[PDB]
Amino acid sequence: GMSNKFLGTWKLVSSENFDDYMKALGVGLATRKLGNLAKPTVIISKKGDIITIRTESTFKNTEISFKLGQEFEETTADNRKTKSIVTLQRGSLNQVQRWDGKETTIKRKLVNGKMVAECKMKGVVCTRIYEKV
Numbered sequence: 001g002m003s004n005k006f007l008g009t010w011k012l013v014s015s016e017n018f019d020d021y022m023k024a025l026g027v028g029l030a031t032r033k034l035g036n037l038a039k040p041t042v043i044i045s046k047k048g049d050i051i052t053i054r055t056e057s058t059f060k061n062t063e064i065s066f067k068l069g070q071e072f073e074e075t076t077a078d079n080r081k082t083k084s085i086v087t088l089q090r091g092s093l094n095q096v097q098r099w100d101g102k103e104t105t106i107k108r109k110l111v112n113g114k115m116v117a118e119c120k121m122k123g124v125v126c127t128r129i130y131e132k133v
C-alpha cells in the first residue's frame with residue numbers, strides 16, 4: 001500500500017504555475033489571489049485501509065478520506081463537486097477528479113524526502129514542493 005513515509009505533516013515551501021492551473025480549473029480572480037498567497041499544511045494519516053488527506057490554510061481547509069481504488073465524492077477547495085479516485089503507481093499517490101466532462105490529476109510523490117505534488121489540467125501543469133515538518 002501507500003508508503004508510511006507519506007504519513008505526517010507537510011508544509012508548502014514552493015509553488016510553480018499554480019495561477020495558470022487555477023485558471024484552467026475556472027477559478028475566479030479574487031479566489032486565485034488568495035490561493036496564490038496560501039501556504040498550506042497537508043496532514044496525511046491512515047486508519048486501517050482508510051487514508052485521510054487534510055489540507056489546512058488560513059483561506060481554506062479541506063479533508064478527504066478514501067480507500068485506494070475506490071471512487072468517492074469530493075468537494076474541492078474551490079468547491080467543485082467531483083467524482084474522485086486515488087490509486088498508487090510506482091509508489092506515487094495519484095488522485096483524479098472528474099466533473100462536468102472535465103478531469104484533473106494531482107500526483108503526490110516522495111522525492112529525496114520531500115513531497116512533490118504535480119497537478120495537471122488541460123495540459124497546464126503545476127508543481128508544489130512540501131517539506132516534512
Ligand SMILES: CCCCCCCCCCCCCCCC(=O)O
Pocket residue numbers: 022027031032034035038040042055057059060061076077078106117119128
Ligand atoms: C487549499 C489551497 C489554497 C486554496 C486555493 C483555492 C483554489 C484552488 C483549489 C484547487 C486546487 C488545489 C490543488 C492542491 C494540490 C496540493 O495538495 O498541493
